Amino acid sequence: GSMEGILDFSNDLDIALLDQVVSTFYQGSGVQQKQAQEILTKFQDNPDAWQKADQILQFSTNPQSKFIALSILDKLITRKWKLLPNDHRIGIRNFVVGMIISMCQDDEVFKTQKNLINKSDLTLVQILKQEWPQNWPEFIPELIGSSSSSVNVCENNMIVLKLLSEEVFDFSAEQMTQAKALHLKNSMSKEFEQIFKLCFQVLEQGSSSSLIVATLESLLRYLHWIPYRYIYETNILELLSTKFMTSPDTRAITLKCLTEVSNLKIPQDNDLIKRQTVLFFQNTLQQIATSVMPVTADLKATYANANGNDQSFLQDLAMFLTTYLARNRALLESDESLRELLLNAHQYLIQLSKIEERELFKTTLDYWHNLVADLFYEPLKKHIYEEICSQLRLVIIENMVRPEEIQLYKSEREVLVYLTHLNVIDTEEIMISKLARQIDGSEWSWHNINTLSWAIGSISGTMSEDTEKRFVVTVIKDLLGLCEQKRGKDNKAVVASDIMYVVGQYPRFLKAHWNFLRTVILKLFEFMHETHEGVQDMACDTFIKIVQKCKYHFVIQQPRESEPFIQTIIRDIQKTTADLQPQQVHTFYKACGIIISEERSVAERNRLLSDLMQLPNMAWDTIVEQSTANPTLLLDSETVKIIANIIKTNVAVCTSMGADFYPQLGHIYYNMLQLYRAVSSMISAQVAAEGLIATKTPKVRGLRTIKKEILKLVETYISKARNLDDVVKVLVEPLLNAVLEDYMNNVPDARDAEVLNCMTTVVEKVGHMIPQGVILILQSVFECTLDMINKDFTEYPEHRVEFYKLLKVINEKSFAAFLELPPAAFKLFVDAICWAFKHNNRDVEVNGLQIALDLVKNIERMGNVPFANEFHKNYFFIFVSETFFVLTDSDHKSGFSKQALLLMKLISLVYDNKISVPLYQEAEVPQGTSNQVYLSQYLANMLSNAFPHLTSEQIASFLSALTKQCKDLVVFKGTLRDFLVQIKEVGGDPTDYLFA
C-alpha cells in the first residue's frame, strides 16, 4: 500500500518511508518482507535512483538504507560514469571522500558501522578505477598525509589500499580491458614506494592492533605482486617472524603473510637471501613452540575442541609449513645446526596430520607425497627422515579410506607405497602389530578392521615376491583365526569380506599358487549362496576382480588338473548362480567372458562361448518358439523379465568379449530383430489403447527394456567389432529396417533415445562403407527428432544429447549424406546447429560448436564449386551473427573458447580470400568490392544495432583489431574479452584494442 510510494519518482523521496521499506525487509518476515523486497529491487533498478543517493547518505539514520544508496552509486560508477557531466563526477567523488572522513572522525560510528564504512571504501575504489591517476594524481600523497593525523583514518586508508590492490591485481582479468589493467597496475607499481614507506612505519611504531591487523591485511594482498626486494632488503621479515607471531590478533594474518612470502619470486643463488629465508622460518617456529604450543601438543584434541579461532589457525599453520618446506626444505637438510628445525617443523606436520578433518588431511597428504617421492628418488635424503616416516606409516594406515572414495585412496596408496619401499621391514611390522591388536580386541571394531584391510591391500606388488609370500600368508592366517574367534554372523561376515578383499588385492600371490587360487574361487561360490546382506555382492565383485587380474590361470590347464578351470566353472554355472539376483548373474557371466577371450584358439573360444551361453540360449529358443507361434505370451510380465535377462546376459558377455562375441550374436541376431518388431507393435498398440500414460506402466516399460537392451547389445558389439565387412554385410541392413521406421512412426514419448545412440556407433565404425544407409538414418530420425527438441531447451534431455552426437559423427564420417538433403532440409540442419549454440547444457553446446566448425572445414574442402558458393551466400553471415550473439549475451560463458575458435575460422576465410563469390547480393554494394570490406561493413552495422551505446570508433577499432588478429588465437580471444567488458559500460576507450 503505502510502501509503493517510493517508486513514485514524481515527488520528493520520503526518507522515513524508505527506512520502513528497508526495515520491513531486513527485520520483518513472510508476506511483509517479500513485498518490501520487490519494491527495493524496483527502486534500486530505477535508472534515476543514484540522484537521490547523497540525499539518503546525509538524511537517513539507517545503515541498511545507506548501504543500498552506495550499491546504486556503485552501479552507476562501474557502468554509466563517463556519460555523466564532469561536475557530477567531482561532486560524487567529494561526498564519498567527505562521508568516509566524516565516519572515521566519529569513534561511535567508526566502531559500530564497519559494514557501511567498508562499502563506502569499495565505492571509493570504483571511482579510482575510473579516475586515478590521470584525473586524481595527488590521491596517494593526500592519503598518506591524512594517515599521520587520525589513527581511525589511517586504519581505514589501509582497508582502501587493500581493496585497491585486490581490484587491480587479483580481480582485474575478467572485469577490465587488458590496457586498463596494465594502466592501473603500472600506476600502483609507480607509487608503491610511498605506500610501503607508510606500512613499514606503522608496523614498527605499532600503537593499535586494529590498525596493525588492517596494515597486515593490506600487506597480504601486496605480496601477490610486489618485487621481493621490499621484503628481503628491508627489516620487515624480522617483524613478521617475531613481533607479530607473539600477539594472537596479529598472529593469524601474519602466518598468511609468511605463507605468501614463501612463494615470492627470489634469486635462487644468493647466500644472504638463503640465510634470510632460513631465518624467518627459524623465528616463526620458535614463536609457535613458546607462544602457541610445543612440538608434543596433541593437536587432534585441540582442533576437535574448536575453541576460538584455533581450527583456522591450525589450518593456516599446515598451509605455512607445507608451502615453505615444499619450496625450501633443501636449505635445511645440509647444515647440522638446522637439523632440529627441519625435524620439528615435520613433527608439527605429523601432529597436524592426526587431526580429524578430511580437507586438512588432504592438504598435508599432498606435502607427504611431495616428500616421500623426493626421498625415493633423491640421493642421501631418506636417512634424515627415518623417524618422521615411521610415524607417517601409522598415520596413513590408521586413516586409510575405502577404494570407492577414488581420489583420497589414490593419494594415500601412492604415499604408502613409497613409505613401504623406503622401509619394508617397518611397514610390515606396523601392519602385523595392528593385526595383533584386532585379534586381542583392544582396537577391535568393524570400521578398524576394514581400514587395516584397505591399508594392507594398498601396498601390493611393492615387497619382493618372496617377502610378499611370507607377509600374505601371515596376514591371511591371522584373519582366518580372527573369523573363527569371533561370534555372531555379523562379525564373521565383516572379516570374511576383509579376508576376501585382501586376497583380491594380491594377484601375484594368486598367480604363483594355483591350489590356493582354486580354494578362494570355490569359497566365493559357497558365498554366492549366503542370504546375509552384502555377501553375495562381495562374492561377485571379488570374483570378477580376481578374474580380471589372473585371466591366464583359468584359461590354461594347470598341473594336476584334468582341464582348464574355466570348463569347471561353466559346468556348475546353474548350481553356482542359482541363489543370485539377475544383475549378479550378469557379472558372473561377464567374468566368465573375460576368461574365454584369453583362449586364442578359435575353435576352443567359440566352443567355450556356446557352452557358457547354454542356459540363456535354451531359455531363448523356447521363448522364440512360444511367442512367434502365439504373440499372446509376450503380454505376461514374467516372460518379459526372462527375455530382458537373456539379452542383459548377452550384453554382459559381449562387453568383456567384444569382437569374439560374433558367433553368439549370430545365433540370436535375426530372431532378436524379429522380437524387436513384435515388442514395438505391442508398445504402439498399448499407446493407442491406454493413451500416453501407457509409457509409464510396468507392462510397457518392461517391453521398452527389451528394445533398449537389444539396441545396447548391438551397439556394444559394433563398437568393438574387428570384422567390419561382416558388420556391413550381415548386421546393418537388418538393423536399420528393424529400428528406423519404428522410431519415426512412434509418437515422441514412445521413441527410444537409445536408437540414436546405437546409430551414432554404427556411423562411427562403418559410416564410410554405407553412404546409402546413412541417408536412411537421417531421413528416419533427423526432422522428427528436431521437432521434439526445438520448442524449449529442457524437454527430451537424452534425445537432445544423442541427436547432436549423431549429427557430429555423420558430419565427420559421411558428409555426403548432408549434400543429398533437399535445400529446405539442409536449412533445418543449419537451424539445428545454431540451436545447439544457445544451450546451457554443455553436452549439446560443445557438439553444436564442433559441428559448426567441422561443417565450415568440410565446405572449404570442396573448393570452388556451386554448393560451397551457395552455402556461403546463404549461411556465412548466419553463423557469424549467431556466434557473436552467444559470445556477447553473458549466458554462454562456458563455451567462450570454441565460440572464439569458430568465429576466428569464419573471419580467416574472408581474410585469406577463401570464399570465391560476392557475399553481398545484386546492387547492394559497388561492383569491385572485396569480401573483407563488406565483412567490416556488415559487422560494423550488426554491432551498432545490437549495442547502440558503443560509438562508431569503438566498433571500427574493435573490428580492425579483431580481423588483424585472426591468425593468432589467444590474442583474438583477448580482443573478444576486451569487447565483453566494453559492452557492459559507456564510453570505453577505443585505443584499448591496440594492446599488443
Partner: peptide, 17 residues
Amino acid sequence: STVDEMTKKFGTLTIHD
C-alpha cells in the same frame, strides 16, 4: 607346507558359528 596349511584353514572359513 606353510602355504598348504593356510590353504586348508581357508577351506573351512564360514559365516556360521
